[PDB]
Amino acid sequence: HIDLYQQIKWNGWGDTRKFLHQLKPSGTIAMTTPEVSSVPLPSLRGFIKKELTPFVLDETPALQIENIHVDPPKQYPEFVRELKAFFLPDQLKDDKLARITHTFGKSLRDLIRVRIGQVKNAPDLIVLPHSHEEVERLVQLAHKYNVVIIPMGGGSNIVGAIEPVSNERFTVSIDMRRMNKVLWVDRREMTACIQVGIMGPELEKQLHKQGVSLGHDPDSFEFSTLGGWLATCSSGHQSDKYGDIEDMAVSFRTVTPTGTLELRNGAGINYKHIILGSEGTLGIITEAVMKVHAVPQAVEYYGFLFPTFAHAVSALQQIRSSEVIPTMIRVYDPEETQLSFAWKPSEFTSAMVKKYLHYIRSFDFKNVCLSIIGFEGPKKVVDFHRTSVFDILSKNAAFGLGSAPGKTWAEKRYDLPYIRDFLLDHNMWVDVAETTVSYANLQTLWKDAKQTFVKHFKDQGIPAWICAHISHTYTNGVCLYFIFASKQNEDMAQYIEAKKLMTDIIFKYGGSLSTRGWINVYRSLKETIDPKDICNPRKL
Amino acid sequence: MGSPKEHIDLYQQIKWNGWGDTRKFLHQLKPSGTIAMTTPEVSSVPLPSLRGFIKKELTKPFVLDETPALQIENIHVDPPKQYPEFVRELKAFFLPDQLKDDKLARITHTFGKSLRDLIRVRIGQVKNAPDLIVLPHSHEEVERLVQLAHKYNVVIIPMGGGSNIVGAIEPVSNERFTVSIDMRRMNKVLWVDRREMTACIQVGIMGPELEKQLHKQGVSLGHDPDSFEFSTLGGWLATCSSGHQSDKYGDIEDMAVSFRTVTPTGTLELRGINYKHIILGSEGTLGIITEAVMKVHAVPQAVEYYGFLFPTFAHAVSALQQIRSSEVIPTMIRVYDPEETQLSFAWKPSKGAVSEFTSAMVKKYLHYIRSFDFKNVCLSIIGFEGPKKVVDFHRTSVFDILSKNAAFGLGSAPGKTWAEKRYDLPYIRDFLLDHNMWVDVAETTVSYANLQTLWKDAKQTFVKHFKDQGIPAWICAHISHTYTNGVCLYFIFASKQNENKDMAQYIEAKKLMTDIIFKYGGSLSRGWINVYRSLKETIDPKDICNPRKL
Numbered sequence A: 001h002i003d004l005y006q007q008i009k010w011n012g013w014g015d016t017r018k019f020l021h022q023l024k025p026s027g028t029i030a031m032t033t034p035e036v037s038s039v040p041l042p043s044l045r046g047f048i049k050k051e052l053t054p055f056v057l058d059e060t061p062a063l064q065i066e067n068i069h070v071d072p073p074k075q076y077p078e079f080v081r082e083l084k085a086f087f088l089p090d091q092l093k094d095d096k097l098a099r100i101t102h103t104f105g106k107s108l109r110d111l112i113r114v115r116i117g118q119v120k121n122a123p124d125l126i127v128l129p130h131s132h133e134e135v136e137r138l139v140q141l142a143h144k145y146n147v148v149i150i151p152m153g154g155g156s157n158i159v160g161a162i163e164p165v166s167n168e169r170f171t172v173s174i175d176m177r178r179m180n181k182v183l184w185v186d187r188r189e190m191t192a193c194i195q196v197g198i199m200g201p202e203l204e205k206q207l208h209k210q211g212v213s214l215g216h217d218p219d220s221f222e223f224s225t226l227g228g229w230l231a232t233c234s235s236g237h238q239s240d241k242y243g244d245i246e247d248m249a250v251s252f253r254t255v256t257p258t259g260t261l262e263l264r265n266g267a268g269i270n271y272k273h274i275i276l277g278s279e280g281t282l283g284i285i286t287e288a289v290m291k292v293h294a295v296p297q298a299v300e301y302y303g304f305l306f307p308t309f310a311h312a313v314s315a316l317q318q319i320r321s322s323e324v325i326p327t328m329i330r331v332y333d334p335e336e337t338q339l340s341f342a343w344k345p346s347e348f349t350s351a352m353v354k355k356y357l358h359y360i361r362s363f364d365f366k367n368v369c370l371s372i373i374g375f376e377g378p379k380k381v382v383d384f385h386r387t388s389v390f391d392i393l394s395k396n397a398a399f400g401l402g403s404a405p406g407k408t409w410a411e412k413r414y415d416l417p418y419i420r421d422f423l424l425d426h427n428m429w430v431d432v433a434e435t436t437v438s439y440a441n442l443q444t445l446w447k448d449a450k451q452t453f454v455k456h457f458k459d460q461g462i463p464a465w466i467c468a469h470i471s472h473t474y475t476n477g478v479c480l481y482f483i484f485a486s487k488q489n490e491d492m493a494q495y496i497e498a499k500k501l502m503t504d505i506i507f508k509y510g511g512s513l514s515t516r517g518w519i520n521v522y523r524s525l526k527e528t529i530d531p532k533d534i535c536n537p538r539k540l
Numbered sequence B: 001m002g003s004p005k006e007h008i009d010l011y012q013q014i015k016w017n018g019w020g021d022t023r024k025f026l027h028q029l030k031p032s033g034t035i036a037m038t039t040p041e042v043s044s045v046p047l048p049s050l051r052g053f054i055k056k057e058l059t060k061p062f063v064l065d066e067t068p069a070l071q072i073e074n075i076h077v078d079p080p081k082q083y084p085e086f087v088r089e090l091k092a093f094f095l096p097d098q099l100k101d102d103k104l105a106r107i108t109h110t111f112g113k114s115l116r117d118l119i120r121v122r123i124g125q126v127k128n129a130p131d132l133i134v135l136p137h138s139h140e141e142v143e144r145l146v147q148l149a150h151k152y153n154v155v156i157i158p159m160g161g162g163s164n165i166v167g168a169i170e171p172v173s174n175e176r177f178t179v180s181i182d183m184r185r186m187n188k189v190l191w192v193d194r195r196e197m198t199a200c201i202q203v204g205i206m207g208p209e210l211e212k213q214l215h216k217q218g219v220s221l222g223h224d225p226d227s228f229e230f231s232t233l234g235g236w237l238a239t240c241s242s243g244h245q246s247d248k249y250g251d252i253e254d255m256a257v258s259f260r261t262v263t264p265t266g267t268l269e270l271r272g273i274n275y276k277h278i279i280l281g282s283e284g285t286l287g288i289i290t291e292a293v294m295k296v297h298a299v300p301q302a303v304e305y306y307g308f309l310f311p312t313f314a315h316a317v318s319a320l321q322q323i324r325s326s327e328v329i330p331t332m333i334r335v336y337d338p339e340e341t342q343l344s345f346a347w348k349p350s351k352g353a354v355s356e357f358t359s360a361m362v363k364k365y366l367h368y369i370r371s372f373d374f375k376n377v378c379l380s381i382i383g384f385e386g387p388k389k390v391v392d393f394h395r396t397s398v399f400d401i402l403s404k405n406a407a408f409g410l411g412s413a414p415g416k417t418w419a420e421k422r423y424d425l426p427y428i429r430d431f432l433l434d435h436n437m438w439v440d441v442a443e444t445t446v447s448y449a450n451l452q453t454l455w456k457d458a459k460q461t462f463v464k465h466f467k468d469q470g471i472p473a474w475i476c477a478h479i480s481h482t483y484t485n486g487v488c489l490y491f492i493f494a495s496k497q498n499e500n501k502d503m504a505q506y507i508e509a510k511k512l513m514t515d516i517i518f519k520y521g522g523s524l525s526r527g528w529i530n531v532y533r534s535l536k537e538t539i540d541p542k543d544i545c546n547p548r549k550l
């Protein structure tokens, strides 16, 4: 048995066996996976050279684990004694690696910090429970002994939600990832009871064996957990079809310092909404009953090009107005489109790349935008939705790139965080900001933000690059996501300044960022459920 | 600041011992014995088949034995409590016409519309009336009222339509001075934003007035409980009521974007934890909702509602299951069992507009039951709303599935008139109660495995229980919503009042139905109590907001 904390990079993203790297001396950037070694991505180096400039990649390696200092764990003999009376020794970890991997999430600041060995407060112990009943025991003991507890799923959050902040008390990281089994599937009710430490791909694999699927698909799907999705109410990119995570949740069990809270599968409070989004501050979710659907009979994904971001946006608007909507859509601006096409290492993909070439002779590639559009469901439904959406696309100057079998279209976003580790290894950095903005303000915010970010650095003699995509649309606007990148300097101050620039410009267009009588309400809930404040204290 | 000239309040326009408009009612024409419907728009339209239906089901010459309710001036109500200092403060901010404490005001703010409520008011049994009714005109005025009630330790109970059937507005004790806050003068749409598709609405507004006001601005909400005509937005939010277009427009909780709640410890405003869910369903125990921002939609391009007959309840259930499995569903569906189908067709008026074709569909029903035994024939009403292209696709899909389950089409009728006839049902309960009869209801969600056995067993058991006592009884059912593995099943059951007039006969009928629903795993209507108690003690430290024991 290998634990997931040993399988996922402790100072980067995702599988330890998968990574980008520079082949020397050609300089060709390649991608290695467990299934294939060193596949050349010949267009990628040219892209990085063009954008962020005899081209040399300056190496800025991460510190080796042996060279990182962490203070000794605190001691609490009488509490640890009690743990060891119920838990097996392989369930308790306090080695350097276990401590580091249960300190940090996956934000830029997290990675910068671990990569230079800056480890302020690590947890004193990692516990890996195997069942709901074990969780109940651990939480009861933490409450008795006044021990801070922080539950962890994939540790993929980018908001510091798992960072230990309570150096006065013994603190325990509860790694939920050994609780990773689908307990049952009810094919009449179309529901499934799932242990919430399960990772995304494992969940969809186990469900598929019983002919069903959940369909919750954040961009972190590969390395995040059901329990994390519930505790953060994370967005999914098939939500336009399958619902939001809170709609998918039928019920779940929450272990709290004052007892276990059960939910049932009209008037009164709908109590699940107290725990959904609570980020471990109100107890630990152990098992959830989730609404599932049959594996669809048709799954069809297509690419399209538009001449401008404006055209793509108009198509987005009219699709939503039609009330006949795809399962998934994403629109990439020209910068992200170019990146997508330089992400090329298959018979169907090169055919698409030929179609892009043809298009950009007439339509300037500086302005051309890629859109990926997917449909899932019964054949009759897919056919009606596809024909509706294609009609609207044709009316908005869309150019079909055709299709390939599968969904590897929609799975390209999963690889992005791997490129982030490659930039950080070669004197570069990349961060993100996401906003909701109305249609009236979108195109000015998009153009202004991009122009402002680049010029800020250009004025200082420093290259910088920014792209954006649209993942979701609402009645009168969109969710717009910026990805922006530049060279490292010779402090944390440069990433804080760039974010400030972006945050300011986004506010300038009433883009969304993030007497309150609800504060007293939350304080009531917290003081009642967790009177000793042991559950992920001091978190926003 | 005053109510406009000639304004009369809704508590005076809705029956104080019955349902709905005081001007609308069923009545027996004399000497013919013919049952007729009067409305404020047309008087005494005969329902020539209705008397014979009641005769057949609940029985020599047939006579309706008259059992009138007591007149209002013959009802005793204990004098109201006095709180001079509290009332004098009210008069520095509220007009005399906003404050009421006469018998009519007190009775109409005591009772909802359950059978037990109607039985009690009809016999003058009024044990816990509020002491004062206040009718605020704005959010600011509710804030003032709630601040004063907290300061003076006065019980406050908000009311909308008073249509609830669970006793939710009825004062539970008389220890403290008690105020009913009638929200119904706060009845305006404040704004509509057609770009965002949202509207800000004062929640004292009644269903039809809401849809009317929104329609003027080209939009609609689409929440349609069977009590739509005489219930309020505020009440829908505070009860999480069901609506019969929810298959298209969603539940009230998802229609609610945000709202303002006036509490004894301040006003909670809405924009981690999704806080709206703390107040939704709270039944006035956590404060008063004043104004709500609701998600609305454009008035549909196409609205098409159809009737169909099936040879048996089984055929109809199969069609419903296959419809949901296909994933292409109607905006509304209702399946009526044979007994409710018969009732529907027996209620035909003898008059109609030149633009109305009920006679065409009655005739089709009569021709159909020549080939299919009427004791098994079921009516279904199926409606579609939206863009023409969407309605066309959904209708063709659904109509295909119907033809595979032996459905027989009766055709459309204009707008939602097919679905508007359910609003008339509670007027007949008043007619029954005036003529020595009673009717009650039981609603349950039941699995498909148990649906048809529960339906047959419950109907048989109920009828037999009274037939063995030599008492006539009648029972029907319909299905209003379907789920992955079950349906919402609604029973309507009726019998004679006993010559000795005791509330024990109603609790007994209810117990039989409750018992059997429970046998078949039908739904009925916890460390979370300590959570609630903490919320309550925080929001409402003096326990003035609709105090309950449990």
Ligand SMILES: Cc1cc2nc3c(=O)[nH]c(=O)nc-3n(C[C@H](O)[C@H](O)[C@H](O)COP(=O)(O)OP(=O)(O)OC[C@H]3O[C@@H](n4cnc5c(N)ncnc54)[C@H](O)[C@@H]3O)c2cc1C
Binding pocket: A105, A106, A107, A150, A151, A152, A153, A154, A155, A156, A157, A158, A161, A162, A176, A196, A197, A217, A218, A219, A220, A223, A224, A225, A226, A227, A228, A229, A230, A231, A232, A233, A234, A235, A236, A278, A279, A280, A281, A283, A284, A285, A286, A417, A536
């Ligand atoms: C490359 C990348 C892409 C991303 N894409 C998206 C996206 O598309 N949409 C989106 O919303 N977010 C996205 N995120 C953010 C993050 O992945 C999601 O919020 C995810 O829900 C966190 O899941 P996790 O299992 O990794 O949680 P963790 O990071 O381990 O924990 C998150 C919070 O949940 C609490 N928690 C975890 N498990 C439990 C439990 N069982 N009981 C109680 N509390 C618990 C933790 O204490 C913490 O407060 C992205 C992040 C990255 C780095």
Ligand SMILES: Cc1cc2nc3c(=O)[nH]c(=O)nc-3n(C[C@H](O)[C@H](O)[C@H](O)COP(=O)(O)OP(=O)(O)OC[C@H]3O[C@@H](n4cnc5c(N)ncnc54)[C@H](O)[C@@H]3O)c2cc1C
Binding pocket: B112, B113, B114, B157, B158, B159, B160, B161, B162, B163, B164, B165, B168, B169, B183, B203, B204, B224, B225, B226, B227, B228, B230, B231, B232, B233, B234, B235, B236, B237, B238, B239, B240, B241, B242, B243, B282, B283, B284, B285, B287, B288, B289, B290, B426, B546
């Ligand atoms: C014939 C009939 C048919 C019905 N059909 C249905 C149906 O199809 N679906 C369904 O779900 N129910 C149905 N009901 C029940 C009832 O109509 C619903 O619960 C409706 O939501 C109640 O609305 P109301 O305005 O009449 O509320 P009221 O009865 O006036 O009050 C209900 C509760 O809400 C609280 N309240 C009211 N306004 C406010 C406010 N502004 N702020 C805070 N609290 C408030 C009250 O104190 C009370 O606790 C039916 C009832 C009848 C009699």
Ligand SMILES: CCCCCCCCCCCCCCCCO
Binding pocket: A047, A048, A051, A052, A106, A107, A158, A339, A416, A417, A419, A420, A430, A431, A432, A465, A483, A485
């Ligand atoms: C010079 C251009 C190179 C292309 C670099 C684009 C890399 C995109 C990396 C994505 C970053 C991971 C996101 C972390 C937070 C998620 O919301």
Ligand SMILES: CCCCCCCCCCCCCCCCO
Binding pocket: B053, B054, B057, B058, B113, B114, B115, B165, B343, B425, B426, B428, B429, B439, B440, B441, B474, B492, B494
């Ligand atoms: C034999 C004829 C009986 C007449 C049929 C009466 C059916 C009318 C149902 C009215 C019930 C409406 C009020 C119920 C209270 C709760 O909702």
